[PDB]
Amino acid sequence: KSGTWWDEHLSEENVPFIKQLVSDEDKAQLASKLCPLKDEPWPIHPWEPGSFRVGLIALKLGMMPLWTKDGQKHVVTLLQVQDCHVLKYTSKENCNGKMATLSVGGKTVSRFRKATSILEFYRELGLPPKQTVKIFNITDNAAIKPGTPLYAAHFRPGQYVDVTAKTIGKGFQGVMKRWGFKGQPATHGQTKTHRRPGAVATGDIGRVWPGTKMPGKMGNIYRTEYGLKVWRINTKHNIIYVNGSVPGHKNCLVKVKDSKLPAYKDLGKNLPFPTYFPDGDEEELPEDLYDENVCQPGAPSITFA
Amino acid sequence: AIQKMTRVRVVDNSALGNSPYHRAPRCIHVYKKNGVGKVGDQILLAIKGQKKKALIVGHCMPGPRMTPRFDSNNVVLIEDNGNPVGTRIKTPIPTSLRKREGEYSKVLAIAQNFV
Amino acid sequence: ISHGRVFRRMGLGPESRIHLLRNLLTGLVRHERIEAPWARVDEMRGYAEKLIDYGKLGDTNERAMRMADFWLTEKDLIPKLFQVLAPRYKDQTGGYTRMLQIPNRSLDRAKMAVIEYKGNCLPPLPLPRRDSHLTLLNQLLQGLRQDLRQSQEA
Amino acid sequence: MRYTDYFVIVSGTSTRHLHAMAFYVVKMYKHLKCKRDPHVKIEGKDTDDWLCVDFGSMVIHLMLPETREIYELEKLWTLRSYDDQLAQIAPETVPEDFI
Amino acid sequence: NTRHIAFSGNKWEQKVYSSHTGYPGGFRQVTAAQLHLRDPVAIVKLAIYGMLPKNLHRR
Amino acid sequence: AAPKNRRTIEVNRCRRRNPQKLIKVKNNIDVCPECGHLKQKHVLCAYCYEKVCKETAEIRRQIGKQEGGPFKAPTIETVVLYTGETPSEQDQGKRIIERDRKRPSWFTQN
RNA sequence: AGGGUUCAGCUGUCUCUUACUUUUAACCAGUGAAAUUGACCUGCCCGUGAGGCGGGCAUAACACAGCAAGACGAGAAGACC
RNA sequence: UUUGGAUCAGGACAUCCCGAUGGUGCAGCCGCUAUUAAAGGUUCGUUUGUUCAACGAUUAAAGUCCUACGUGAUCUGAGUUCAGACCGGAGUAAUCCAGGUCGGUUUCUAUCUACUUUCAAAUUCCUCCCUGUACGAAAGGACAAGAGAAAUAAGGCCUACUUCACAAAGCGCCUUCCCCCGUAAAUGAUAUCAUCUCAACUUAGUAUACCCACCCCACCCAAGAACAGGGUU
Ligand SMILES: [K+]
Ligand SMILES: [K+]
Ligand SMILES: [Mg+2]
Ligand SMILES: [Mg+2]
Ligand SMILES: [Mg+2]
Ligand SMILES: [Mg+2]
Ligand SMILES: [Mg+2]
Ligand SMILES: [Mg+2]
Ligand SMILES: [Mg+2]
Ligand SMILES: [Mg+2]
Ligand SMILES: [Mg+2]
Ligand SMILES: [Mg+2]
Ligand SMILES: [Mg+2]
Ligand SMILES: [Mg+2]
Ligand SMILES: [Mg+2]
Ligand SMILES: [Mg+2]
Ligand SMILES: [Mg+2]
Ligand SMILES: [Mg+2]
Ligand SMILES: [Mg+2]
Ligand SMILES: [Mg+2]
Ligand SMILES: [Mg+2]
Ligand SMILES: [Mg+2]
Ligand SMILES: [Mg+2]
Ligand SMILES: [Zn+2]
C-alpha cells in the first residue's frame, strides 16, 4: 500500500554493488548481440522492386555547416544511432494489414523505471530496455531476426530519408503565436485588445464551427519532415548528417526511414538489403562516407572554374 | 531592406541623380512580390518630380555571409528598357549581379570597383 | 515559454532578488544554519557554495575581497569567511552546504527548507539514514556479492 | 579586376545586325561544344542601341557608334580609375554645415 | 451476399448517400455505386437502420 | 456576464463532490524511528527538528551573551561543552561555549 | 492646452512583430461580496412558428483552463413616433 | 402633358485568374464566343471619406453577393442627436432650420449551448533548352517533356546573421508527394445506308505517412496553468 523504489532499502555498502552489477549486465547483453550473421540469421533475400526495408531510431545531437564543391553552404543535423535493435517481427496475416510490421528500439534506459511487463518482455529478448519503440512497415522479404543490431551504415550518402519526432512544446498559447493571427493595433483607442482573436463565427449560425482556430496547447506533437538527403555518414560513431532541420529538441529520439515520395521511389537498388552486416562484410567501411558534392575537410582549398 | 518611401543614394553620375539641394530620392514602388528589395532588385523612384526605374546595387541591411555590407543604401538609375542613365559608377558594387539573373552586364561594364 | 531559464523570478525584481539572496547568505554565514522557504534556500545554495571557493581564493586576492565585501552586509563576517570557513573546507572540493526539507510553517503552509554549512558546531540534525546492512534484503545482496566475488576469484 | 578574361566591344550597322550577330554567335557556341557549362542568355533584347552576352569567361557587347561614344568603354577598361569621365566625377564628397 | 443486391431502375446512379463530418465544407455525397464499392454492406445496413424505429432501442 | 438560471442542488453536488475536488490520501507517512511520532519520508521529523532547534537556540543565546555586542564575530572555531566536560586535545584555540546541562544523547561529541 | 495644414528630425504607429521585468494570472493556506436566477433531466441540420414543435442525425457520467458565435445575453441604456 | 474600418471570416455561383473542351478567326503570336468547373488566390498607397468620388504604381486576377454594416459581453470612425456656441435664414419673442461649422462619458467578474491540433497529398509567376524551332513573304513567334530561380501558404529549426544569450524569436534557415471527366472518337439495328449509345458495347483523365508496450514517494526536465508526460544506471 506504500510506494517504493529500487534503492529504498539498499544500504551504503550495497548501492554501488547493485549499480555496477546492473551496468555490467547491460554492457554484456549489449555486446553479446554484435555477431548477428553467426547466431543463425534469418534468410537474406536479394533486393526487388516494391520492397520496403526497416529504418532507424536516432538521437538529435545538433547541427553544423557543410559546404559543397559548388561552394554552397547547407546545414546538416547530426543523428546518432545508438543501441538501435530489432525487437520483434509480426507477420502480415497477424498484423491484418497490407504490409508486415517490424519493431525497433533504441537508447537503452534503466530497468528500474520500466513496467513489469516491459521488463519481462526484454528479459527473454536479452537486451536492456529501450526508451522508445517504433513500428516500421516492411515486405515479407525484408524480415530481420529479432535481437539484430542496426548501425548508421544501413543508410548511404545521396539517399533521401524522412524523419518523424515530437516537436518542441510551447504549452498554452494565444492565437497570434499559435495560428499567426495579426491581432489589433496597440494604439488609437484600442481597449484591452492587442492580441485578441476578435470575431469567432457568424451571427446566423449561433454556434462555433468544429475545428475553429482558438487558443490552446501548442506543440509536443509528432511531425514528419520529408525529402531530406544524407550528406555524410560517420561509421565509427554511427552518425548520419541529414540535410536541413528535423523536428524536436536536442537529445531527442527521431524515427528515420526511407523517403515515401513518389519521385524518389525505387532508389534502394544499391542500398543494403535488408540491412548492413559488418560482421559478415568482406571489406571494412571507410571512417566517413561522404557525398560526391561534399568537400572533405582534408581536401585542399576549392578553386572554381 | 529597401521598400516604399525609403530614401536611397544614387551612385552613378547621372544628371538626374545629381541633386543641387542635397535631397535624396525615395522609392515609391518595389517590383517584387513581397515589396522588399534586396541586392539586384528593381524599384521605382520619385526623383525630381519624375518616376524613374532604378536598380539597387547595395543596401545597409545585412545579407548572406561573404557578401559585403554597405553603410548606405545604394542604387543606380536605369531606363525603361534597361540601358543605364548614368555613365560610370565610382563606389564599389558587389559582384553578385553576375550570379543573379537579370539585365546587369551594362552596369557591370560601366562599374569601376568591386568588393 | 521558459526553457533553460535557471534563475527564478522572486522579489520585486533582479535587484530585490539579489538583495534577498544576499541577506540569506549573510544570515547563513553568521549562524552556520538557517531555515527559509524552499525556493529561496534552493536559489541561495549555489551562491553559498561559490562563496567558499571565493574564500579559498585567498583574502589577498582583490577580486575575492571585493566579492566578499559585496556579498557580506555585516563586515565582521569577512574575516570569518577568509579565516574559518575556507580553512575548514580547504581539504574538500565541493558539497559545503547541506539542505533538507522541514515541515510547513503554520503561518501560511509554505514549503520550508533548512540549509547549513557542513562542520558547524551546532547539534546534529536528525539526518535520514539508509537501512542498516543487517536487514534481510541487504544480507541477501551481500551474500550474492560474496558469491560473485569468490566465483570471479576462482 | 575580378570580372572576366576577354571583354569585347563590337559596333554594328543596325539593331537587326546586332541581333543577327548575337544569334549567330550564341548558336555557334551552343552547337560547338561544352555540353556541361551553363547556357548563355541574350541580354538586352528590348534595348535597340545596346546588347550584351556573358559567356563563362568572355563578355561581348554589341553597340552602335553613337552608344559607344556616349559610353566609351575602351578607356574605362584600359585605365582603371584613370578614365576621363571618372576624373571629371568627384571621388567622394560630403556636404558640411551652413555658416 | 450483400454484395450481389439488385437496385430496380437507375437507382445505382440516381440515389445518393450524403453525410457530414461536422467540419466546414465537410458535406459529402456519394452515390449508391460509390457507396457499394467502398463498403458492400453499407447499403443494407443503412436501409435497415432507416426502417428501424427512432428510439434508444434502434442501436 | 450574468447567470441565466439558478444552478440546482443536483448539479452543484455533481460539481462539488467530483473526484478531482476530493482530498487525495497520502501514502508517504511513516513513524520516526527515534521518537515514534509520525513523519513524511522526504520531510524531517517535526519533533526531532524542534528539539534540535530549541537546543540550538539555547546555544546561540549563550554565544550572544558571551560576545556581548554586534559586529563581534570571532575568527576561530567554536566548541560547545556541557557540564562535566573538558576541552579536547584537538579542540584547542577554539572559542568554548559552556552549557549548564547534561549533554544530549543525540548530540554526539566529536 | 482654440479649429485645419505644412518643412525637418524623431521614433514598434506600421511593414511584422520579438525578448525581458513588474502587475495580473494558475496552484496551496486564511477571510470572503454583487448584478442575475419560472422550473430545467439545458445537442446539431432542415421545415414550421427555436434547446424544448415536426422529420432526420448525434449521444456513458464528470472536474479544470481558455473562447466569445447564440441564450432579441434582464444583458447596456439611450434614441424615434 | 443606418453606414464604414480592424480581427476572424462561413457559404452560393450568376467564374476575375488558375483547369479541361467546342466553335471561331488568314499559319504561329494572340484574340472573341460557348460548356463544365468553388480545390486555390484575388495587392499596396494618395486627396478625400456616409463606402464612393478622383486616382498612382503593380499583379494571372485585383469577381458579384448572402451571412441581422456577418462579426461592436472583441475594438473603433460618421450619422441617427442631442445638454454649450457661432455665422446664413425664419419668427415680435421664446425658439427653430433634412441648411455650414467647433467641442462633447455604454458599463459587464462567463451561468448554459457550441468550440479550443480537420493525427499529413501546395499554389502561382519568371528565366534557360527546345528555339529564333515549327510556323511566317516579312513582321514576328509557339510547342510537349525538361532545368533553375522567386513569392506566398502550411509544417518545423537555431549551424551562421540579427533581436538576444544555458533559452525564446525573425529579418534567418529547412521540407512540401494524386485525378477531376465539360466532351473528342471505333463497331452497330430500331430507321438492313448513315448514327459516340437516356440501345445492347469499346476507348481517351471517363492510397500511403505518423500513434501503436504498460515503478513512481521524492528530485530534474528541452514536458507543463493545475493535472498529465519523459529521465533518475
Ligand atoms: K467562442
Ligand atoms: K432596457
Ligand atoms: Mg515546454
Ligand atoms: Mg512560422
Ligand atoms: Mg501588430
Ligand atoms: Mg491599451
Ligand atoms: Mg474605459
Ligand atoms: Mg512575487
Ligand atoms: Mg486572482
Ligand atoms: Mg483560496
Ligand atoms: Mg445576492
Ligand atoms: Mg444533457
Ligand atoms: Mg411560413
Ligand atoms: Mg430555424
Ligand atoms: Mg424536435
Ligand atoms: Mg468551462
Ligand atoms: Mg473608419
Ligand atoms: Mg456552373
Ligand atoms: Mg451591423
Ligand atoms: Mg455578441
Ligand atoms: Mg464632432
Ligand atoms: Mg462624439
Ligand atoms: Mg472575458
Ligand atoms: Zn522524530
CSV table of C-alpha atoms in Angstrom, one decimal, chain F residues 1-108:
chain,number,residue,atom,x,y,z
F,1,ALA,CA,-21.9,38.1,-17.9
F,2,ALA,CA,-24.8,37.3,-15.7
F,3,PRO,CA,-26.2,33.8,-15.0
F,4,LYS,CA,-29.4,32.9,-16.8
F,5,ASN,CA,-30.8,30.4,-14.3
F,6,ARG,CA,-30.2,29.2,-10.8
F,7,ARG,CA,-28.0,26.1,-10.8
F,8,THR,CA,-29.7,23.2,-9.0
F,9,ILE,CA,-28.5,21.3,-6.0
F,10,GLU,CA,-28.0,18.1,-8.0
F,11,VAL,CA,-25.7,19.9,-10.4
F,12,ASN,CA,-23.9,21.6,-7.5
F,13,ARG,CA,-23.4,18.2,-5.9
F,14,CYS,CA,-22.1,16.7,-9.1
F,15,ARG,CA,-19.6,19.6,-9.3
F,16,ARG,CA,-18.5,19.7,-5.7
F,17,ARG,CA,-18.2,16.0,-4.9
F,18,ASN,CA,-16.2,15.3,-8.0
F,19,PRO,CA,-13.2,13.0,-7.5
F,20,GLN,CA,-10.8,15.8,-8.7
F,21,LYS,CA,-12.2,18.1,-5.9
F,22,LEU,CA,-11.9,15.4,-3.2
F,23,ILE,CA,-8.9,15.3,-0.9
F,24,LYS,CA,-6.4,12.7,-2.0
F,25,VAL,CA,-5.0,10.3,0.6
F,26,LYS,CA,-1.2,10.2,1.3
F,27,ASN,CA,0.9,7.0,1.3
F,28,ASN,CA,4.2,8.7,2.3
F,29,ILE,CA,3.6,8.6,6.1
F,30,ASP,CA,5.8,6.6,8.4
F,31,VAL,CA,6.8,6.6,12.1
F,32,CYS,CA,10.0,8.2,13.1
F,33,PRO,CA,12.4,5.5,14.3
F,34,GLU,CA,13.7,7.6,17.2
F,35,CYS,CA,10.7,9.2,18.9
F,36,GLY,CA,7.9,7.2,17.3
F,37,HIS,CA,6.0,10.3,16.1
F,38,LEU,CA,4.6,10.4,12.5
F,39,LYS,CA,6.6,11.9,9.7
F,40,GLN,CA,6.8,12.1,5.9
F,41,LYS,CA,9.5,10.1,4.2
F,42,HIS,CA,11.1,13.1,2.5
F,43,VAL,CA,10.5,15.6,5.4
F,44,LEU,CA,12.4,15.8,8.6
F,45,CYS,CA,10.6,14.8,11.7
F,46,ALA,CA,8.9,17.8,13.4
F,47,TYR,CA,9.6,16.6,17.0
F,48,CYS,CA,13.3,15.9,16.5
F,49,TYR,CA,13.7,19.1,14.4
F,50,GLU,CA,12.1,21.2,17.2
F,51,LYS,CA,14.1,19.7,20.0
F,52,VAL,CA,17.3,20.4,17.9
F,53,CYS,CA,16.1,23.9,17.2
F,54,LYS,CA,15.5,24.6,21.0
F,55,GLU,CA,18.9,23.3,21.8
F,56,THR,CA,20.4,25.4,19.1
F,57,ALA,CA,18.5,28.5,20.4
F,58,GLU,CA,20.0,27.9,23.9
F,59,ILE,CA,23.5,27.6,22.4
F,60,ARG,CA,23.0,30.8,20.4
F,61,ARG,CA,21.8,32.6,23.5
F,62,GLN,CA,24.9,31.6,25.3
F,63,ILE,CA,27.0,32.7,22.3
F,64,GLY,CA,25.4,36.1,22.2
F,65,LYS,CA,25.8,36.6,25.9
F,66,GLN,CA,29.5,35.7,25.5
F,67,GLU,CA,30.1,38.0,22.5
F,68,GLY,CA,28.3,40.9,24.2
F,69,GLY,CA,27.6,43.1,21.2
F,70,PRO,CA,27.1,43.2,17.4
F,71,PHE,CA,29.9,43.1,14.8
F,72,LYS,CA,31.9,40.8,17.1
F,73,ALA,CA,32.1,37.6,15.1
F,74,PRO,CA,35.2,35.6,16.2
F,75,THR,CA,37.8,34.4,13.7
F,76,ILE,CA,38.3,31.0,15.4
F,77,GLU,CA,36.3,27.7,15.5
F,78,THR,CA,33.7,27.1,18.2
F,79,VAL,CA,33.2,24.1,20.5
F,80,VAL,CA,30.2,23.6,22.7
F,81,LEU,CA,30.8,22.0,26.1
F,82,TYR,CA,28.3,20.8,28.7
F,83,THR,CA,28.6,20.1,32.4
F,84,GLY,CA,31.4,17.8,33.3
F,85,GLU,CA,33.2,18.4,30.0
F,86,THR,CA,36.8,19.5,29.3
F,87,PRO,CA,38.3,20.9,26.1
F,88,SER,CA,39.7,18.2,23.9
F,89,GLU,CA,43.3,17.9,22.8
F,90,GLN,CA,42.4,18.8,19.2
F,91,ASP,CA,39.8,21.4,20.5
F,92,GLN,CA,42.5,23.9,21.4
F,93,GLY,CA,42.5,27.5,20.2
F,94,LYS,CA,38.7,27.5,19.8
F,95,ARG,CA,36.0,29.6,21.5
F,96,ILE,CA,34.3,27.4,24.1
F,97,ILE,CA,30.6,27.8,24.7
F,98,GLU,CA,29.7,26.5,28.1
F,99,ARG,CA,26.3,24.9,28.9
F,100,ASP,CA,24.8,24.2,32.3
F,101,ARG,CA,23.1,20.9,31.2
F,102,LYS,CA,23.8,17.3,30.5
F,103,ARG,CA,25.0,16.5,27.0
F,104,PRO,CA,22.1,15.3,24.9
F,105,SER,CA,22.2,11.6,23.8
F,106,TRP,CA,21.7,12.6,20.1
F,107,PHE,CA,24.4,15.3,20.5
F,108,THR,CA,27.3,13.0,19.9
